[PDB]
Chains A and B, each alone.
Chain A
């Protein structure tokens, strides 16, 4: 059954499924966990970095797109580099041509359309990465979940990757609490650190293991690593 319709992305299955897209989604579940959450003033990304050996460095998960926008990756890092680079150019185009900060909602639409073109033509493959885009525009704080299928959803809180259901159940339960954390960045970080810890199983989050990013009302998108995330451990 499955063997005959998974040769390339262009082929539909008898049930109407796209297995190449489904296998690309499986690359996210194999990837490391990352958590996104927001309130009315700030938006926070918390990511768990993965190393190959104890002699290897921890691969970065968060990429800055603009002064008001950024995203965290789960899956293939080169595919995240391509999609983030495109989003960097789209933010750059809006600022140079229109003197306008790109809306986070419109940024999700642009990522949706670029991922879609890989699923309808022959020779192409779907992107093997899930992205969690945070940003602050003219309508406030935003959080968007990107999927290789093209589906982009605006959420208060979400988590993607391995064991990400534990973090997703936490945010769904703590929904009314972290939404009201306004004008206090540190407490929103702690809500995300407690969220990502619900996904832990192999090890505990350490100094060079944790990666946190924040963007808000009077806060540009900045990434904290190593010593800067030690106070949240």
Chain B
């Protein structure tokens, strides 16, 4: 039994026609204090998987170390480590899902909410969620914390079910993600303007984007708002 000290907010994701898009901001919050701003919360495993973690950062760094060890362990006595016997997004998730459930069963959980995004060897999109309780679920759009309340409603407008997946292109899917990051910066008190974005595609591969900022913000309407009821000036 523990408590989270250094925390990372929402991790939002969705799947399009050719792959998946996942994004998370670069903040490491110390309670109400926005302490760290150079924190990468998206962990790429190989060239086909990106793991987005929210919650406790010290536990995230432990998971980050476990993923690096998995790559090293998979390459041992394996001549096809970069081909047929490479790490699939499904293998990476199931390993984490086993760990997350075993830790909560021992009453010492890793205080995190994790989304594994990737493309399988056959070309299929992979997007599954796992948290500190060990609860697992798949959905066309997946988000942690505040993203579940705010980003999901926006991302579900683009992809409402499984039939909307092949209809959504990369440009439309990324636009919905970038817009969701702007909305989260508006209403989440533990959010950062700077964020990272990762695209995993079956054709173009893995595209990792760093130092992206929230742009085109509407604030001009604030000057017209004065007082809290009866005040005119």
Contacts and interface: CB of A to CB of B under 8 A. Distances in A.
Interface of A: 96-100, 103, 105-106, 109, 138-139
Given A98-B95, A106-B77, A139 B90 contact: no
Contacts of B90: 99-100
Interface string B37-59: 00000000000000000000000
A106 B80 CA distance: 12
A9 B12 CA distance: 59
Given A138-B84, A138-B85, A97 B77 contact: no
A109 B77 contact: yes
Contacts of B95: 97-98
Q: How extensive is the interface on chain B, given as a class?
A: 10 to 19
A139 B91 contact: no
Given A106-B77, A106-B78, A97 B84 contact: no
29 contacts: A96-B98, A97-B94, A97-B95, A97-B98, A98-B91, A98-B94, A98-B95, A99-B90, A99-B91, A99-B93, A99-B94, A100-B88, A100-B90, A100-B91, A100-B94, A103-B78, A103-B85, A105-B77, A105-B78, A106-B77, A106-B78, A109-B77, A138-B80, A138-B84, A138-B85, A138-B121, A139-B80, A139-B84, A139-B85
Nearest to A103: B85
A116 to B, nearest CB: 14
Contacts of B88: 100
A99 B80 CA distance: 18
A105 B91 CA distance: 18
Contacts, number: 29
B141 to A, nearest CB: 23
Contacts of A138: 80, 84-85, 121
Contacts of A98: 91, 94-95
B66 to A, nearest CB: 13
Contacts of B80: 138-139
Interface in B68-94: 77-78, 80, 84-85, 88, 90-91, 93-94
Interface string B3-14: 000000000000
Contacts of B78: 103, 105-106
A103 B90 CA distance: 16
Contacts of A106: 77-78
B10 to A, nearest CB: 27
Nearest to B86: A138
A99 B85 CA distance: 13
Contacts of B91: 98-100
